[PDB]
Amino acid sequence: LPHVNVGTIGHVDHGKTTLTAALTRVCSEVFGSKIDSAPEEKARGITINTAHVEYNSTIRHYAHVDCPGHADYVKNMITGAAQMDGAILVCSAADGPMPQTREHILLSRQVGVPYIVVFLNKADLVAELLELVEMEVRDLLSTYDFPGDDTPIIIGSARMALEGKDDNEMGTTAVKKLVETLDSYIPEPVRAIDQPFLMPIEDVFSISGRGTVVTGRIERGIVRVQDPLEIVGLRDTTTTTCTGVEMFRKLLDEGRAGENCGVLLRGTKRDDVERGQVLVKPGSVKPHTKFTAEVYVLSKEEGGRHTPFFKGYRPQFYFRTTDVTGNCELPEGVEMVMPGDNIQMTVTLIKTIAMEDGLRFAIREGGRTVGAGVVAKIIE
Amino acid sequence: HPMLAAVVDDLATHGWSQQAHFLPADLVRALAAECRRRDAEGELNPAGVGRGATQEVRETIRGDQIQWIDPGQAEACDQYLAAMDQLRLAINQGLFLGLEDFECHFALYPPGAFYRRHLDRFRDDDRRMVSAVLYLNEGWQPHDGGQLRMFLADGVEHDVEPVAGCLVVFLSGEVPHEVLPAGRERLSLTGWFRRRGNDPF
Ligand SMILES: Nc1nc2c(ncn2[C@@H]2O[C@H](COP(=O)(O)OP(=O)(O)O)[C@@H](O)[C@H]2O)c(=O)[nH]1
Ligand SMILES: O=C(O)CNC(=O)C(=O)O
Numbered sequence A: 001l002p003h004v005n006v007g008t009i010g011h012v013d014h015g016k017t018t019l020t021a022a023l024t025r026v027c028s029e030v031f032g033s034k035i036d037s038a039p040e041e042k043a044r045g046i047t048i049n050t051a052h053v054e055y056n057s058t059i060r061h062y063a064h065v066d067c068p069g070h071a072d073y074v075k076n077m078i079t080g081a082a083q084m085d086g087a088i089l090v091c092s093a094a095d096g097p098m099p100q101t102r103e104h105i106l107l108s109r110q111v112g113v114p115y116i117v118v119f120l121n122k123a124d125l126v127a128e129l130l131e132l133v134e135m136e137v138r139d140l141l142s143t144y145d146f147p148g149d150d151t152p153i154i155i156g157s158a159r160m161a162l163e164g165k166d167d168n169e170m171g172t173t174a175v176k177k178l179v180e181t182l183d184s185y186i187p188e189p190v191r192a193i194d195q196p197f198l199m200p201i202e203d204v205f206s207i208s209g210r211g212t213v214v215t216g217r218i219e220r221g222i223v224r225v226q227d228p229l230e231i232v233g234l235r236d237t238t239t240t241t242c243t244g245v246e247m248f249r250k251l252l253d254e255g256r257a258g259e260n261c262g263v264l265l266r267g268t269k270r271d272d273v274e275r276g277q278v279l280v281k282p283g284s285v286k287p288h289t290k291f292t293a294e295v296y297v298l299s300k301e302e303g304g305r306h307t308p309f310f311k312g313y314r315p316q317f318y319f320r321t322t323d324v325t326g327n328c329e330l331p332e333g334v335e336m337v338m339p340g341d342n343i344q345m346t347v348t349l350i351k352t353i354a355m356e357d358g359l360r361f362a363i364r365e366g367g368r369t370v371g372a373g374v375v376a377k378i379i380e
Numbered sequence B: 001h002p003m004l005a006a007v008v009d010d011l012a013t014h015g016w017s018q019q020a021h022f023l024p025a026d027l028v029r030a031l032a033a034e035c036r037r038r039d040a041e042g043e044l045n046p047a048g049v050g051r052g053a054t055q056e057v058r059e060t061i062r063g064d065q066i067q068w069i070d071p072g073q074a075e076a077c078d079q080y081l082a083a084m085d086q087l088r089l090a091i092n093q094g095l096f097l098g099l100e101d102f103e104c105h106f107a108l109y110p111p112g113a114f115y116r117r118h119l120d121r122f123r124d125d126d127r128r129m130v131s132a133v134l135y136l137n138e139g140w141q142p143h144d145g146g147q148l149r150m151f152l153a154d155g156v157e158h159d160v161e162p163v164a165g166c167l168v169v170f171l172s173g174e175v176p177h178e179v180l181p182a183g184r185e186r187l188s189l190t191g192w193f194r195r196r197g198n199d200p201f
């Protein structure tokens, strides 16, 4: 049973929270289906108001994210607390597309959500607008570069399905149909360990007699002895070979995603590598400096700034394991930015950093986090 | 200095270490004094359990009273933090664990309070790697109870009396442990070193 991350997005009152309970029941009826004692932690940080449910189809296992408030959607989507492999946009025939519908489709594009599936809710209340409403939404999606013309759209009423109480084909059948669509349209996602090697570098040592070592926690993929590698970031890209992996004073033949270890390089001098760089499968990731980014500015209450900011904000951008200063470029008409607000900006970094579309980063003004962002489009 | 090499060796071979008199008695009394000074001002509060939205004070599991420590509150603590950071770096250089930072708080168990069997690492957040506890109690004795009890490999149990100066370090993801009731006040400085997660925030 593969693990697919999914979630509902759309306007308010349109029935996201309802299609959520509906999905659990239709699956539980038609598809099979303890407290943590650890000591509390110091901070807490952002407060994500997020609900989670689980439900299984025949083919796969789903983890589902629903959110109370629009603001909650914005925080959760930008941070990755709610990262979806495919999202279920809920729109109603009754009311049609509304502001938070546009904002969420857009927001999904920025944050890198791969695929979007639509469920036209409240079908019970209808006729003839279903043709017209599909037309609109399809172009609405296409406006933001999702396959709006070739996108699946299921029509039904979740409240029936939940009570289901299938009256037309619009009840239980349509939710079965939605699940069937997830099974089909959203491809099985690629596990971290099946991705190209990557490890952000923390410390750099030289153990007497065995060469130079860089440590960190492997983000994705696997590194094996005698694998070629590039060191990418803050400096001109360099090549090297892995000559060993160490962990708890034991010698391993390979390091794996999730593992904290030390990697031994061939030849590379201790001064030819530093914190912030990433150890990478060659040509897998490139150095970059200018990008567009969706950002959420933390509230006063969340440890963020007590006051807004303006053009020429040059804060610190934290990418994996190090800081780098960046210039911020806001859209036209935008003068101020309020703590707790979210906006798009074009950032230009003083140094080059290893990045890809969809990389999360933190923004810091003097050590403490004051914003959280995600890379939207690489420019230079 | 050589005492750090010991902890690093111990963690490597056994996954835990205890060292007597890890700090000098003079600094240990001042840490105990800072703990008391805080209690006297109502600055310690019931400690809770769990993370995020499900963090709750459940007094049938954990009953100590706490307050987190930061730099600049008291030189005794600044000294502690400095010792701990020397440890953090030793452990990084010798075991490559990738410890980035350190949470710690003063902890006071009133008599009768306890902490039932648990792992320090959260069920759904794996950032905690090394646990460290420093005790601050003078003239402790076996009749006072209040020992940390550790569940080691192969069914082996080990008790540690909470004696001034004593430091206990273990792998947070791997050594279940509990604190038994005591007949008198029990002061300590508990913390966790932790490694990178999946996000900065
Ligand atoms: N008649 C009907 N009402 C619905 C349907 N879906 C949602 N609603 C109504 O909208 C109310 C609140 O919707 P909710 O699921 O909380 O919307 P959300 O804010 O997007 O989560 C529900 O209790 C229903 O009264 C539906 O399919 N048919
Ligand atoms: O107080 C002790 O001896 C042990 N401390 C803990 O278990 C803790 O705070 O997580």
Ligand SMILES: [Mg+2]
Pocket: A016, A017, A066, A067, A068
């Ligand atoms: Mg809702």
Ligand SMILES: [Mn+2]
Pocket: A039, B118, B119, B120, B177
């Ligand atoms: Mn504990």
